[PDB]
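for the writeup, i need someone to sanity check this before i put it in the appendix. the sequnce is what the collaborator sent (i think, or maybe the updated version? ugh). structure was predicted straight from it, no edits. if anything looks off just tell me and ill rerun, i have time this weekend
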Amino acid sequence: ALCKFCDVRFSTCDNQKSCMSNCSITSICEKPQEVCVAVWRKNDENITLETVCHDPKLPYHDFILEDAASPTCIMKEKKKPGETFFMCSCSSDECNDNIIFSEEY
């Protein structure tokens, strides 16, 4: 897989139906089973977007990437203290470059 892989970066993505990662690093994931991941987090000081490759047989942020087979990165909210946290994974080229905050489409 080819994925955006900037780790955790500041983001201005907020209150939008979709956002671009604005990550300038597209990497070949080390292992063929890895998929793309995006994690959007907002606290009272800032917003970040994390982009990585990850093996979906392993948990990430204490969750299983149950959506790894999806070609698109559909953000879904997770329960975490002191912040708003959304995550998605996907398995098409650079798919974590475009994060979608809804299932409506």
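DSSP finds no helices and ten strands in the chain. The CA atoms of residues 73 and 88 lie 5 Å apart.
thx in advance!!
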